[PDB]
Amino acid sequence: EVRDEVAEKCQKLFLDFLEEFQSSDGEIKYLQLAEELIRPERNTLVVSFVDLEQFNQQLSTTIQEEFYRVYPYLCRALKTFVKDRKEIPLAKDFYVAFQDLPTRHKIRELTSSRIGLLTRISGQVVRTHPVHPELVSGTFLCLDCQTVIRDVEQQFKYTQPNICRNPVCANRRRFLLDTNKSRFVDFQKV
């Protein structure tokens, strides 16, 4: 029922930007780059912030001012755009990353004023930790009634269903993770 209108408008306009932004020469820039995502190893598409700026200042400003709230809707736009063009296994998921941002902030300027806003910094690395797999969307099997629960999205602590859609089950604990149809992403700290 409820819909975040601001987010939906951003999704529509960002899709139009990807499909309509012609180069200095005449071909659609990001359409050509998108073809590399067919490779198994590739997940992330890089977008230039100044290119985004040329389409409309309102969209540029909204993205920077509302980034964390809006970000998952940009991924859906790229997912849709790629799916149109060439065949890829449908279980794969795609990511958007921005660069050429016009400004820079000091470490001591990073304060709770700008939680959630798009930002750029620089520093010197002291230590770097191993790679791990991180769960983003779980699939669970409810054992007492043999029914599957899909796209259980995670937050900081590991969360799961406790009662299923199937009403006769009366379960609370007997749930099994499908580690073959769940999906993960690579994670690293520095």
The contact set with other proteins (CB under 8 A) reads 1-3, 5-6, 8-13, 16, 40-41, 56, 58, 62, 68-69, 80, 108, 111-112, 115-116, 124, 126-127, 130-135, 147, 154, 156-158, 166-168, 177, 179-180, 184-187, 189
- Using a 10 angstrom Cβ sphere, with 0-12 exposed, 13-18 middle and 19 or more buried, the burial of residue 78 is buried
Q: Report d(CA 79, CA 91) in Å as an integer.
A: 11
By beta-carbon proximity to DNA, the closer residue of 61 and 162 is 162
Q: Report d(CA 182, CA 100) in Å as an integer.
A: 35
User: According to CB under 5 A, which one of 18, 70, 77, 142 is a site residue for Zn ion?
Assistant: 142
Q: Report d(CA 176, CA 112) in Å as an integer.
A: 39
189 with 131: CB under 8 angstroms?
Answer: no
Judged by beta carbon distances under 5 to 8 A according to partner kind, the member of DNA, other proteins, Zn ion, none in contact with residue 125 is: none
Q: Report d(CA 170, CA 149) in Å as an integer.
A: 15
44-48 and 95-99 as β-strands: parallel, antiparallel, unpaired?
parallel
Amino acid at 64: Q
By beta-carbon proximity to Zn ion, the closer residue of 135 and 169 is 169
* Window 145-174: contact mask with Zn ion (x via CB under 5 A): x------------------x-x--x-x---
Tell whether residue 3 is a contact of DNA (CB under 7 A).
no
- Minimum CB separation from DNA for residue 141, in Å? 18
Tell whether residue 173 is a contact of DNA (CB under 7 A).
yes
Please choose, from the candidates 96, 89, 91, 88, the residue with its C-alpha nearest in 3D space to the C-alpha of residue 67.
96
Tell whether residue 157 is a contact of DNA (CB under 7 A).
no
The residues of the shown chain that bind DNA, judged by CB under 7 A, are: 162, 172-173
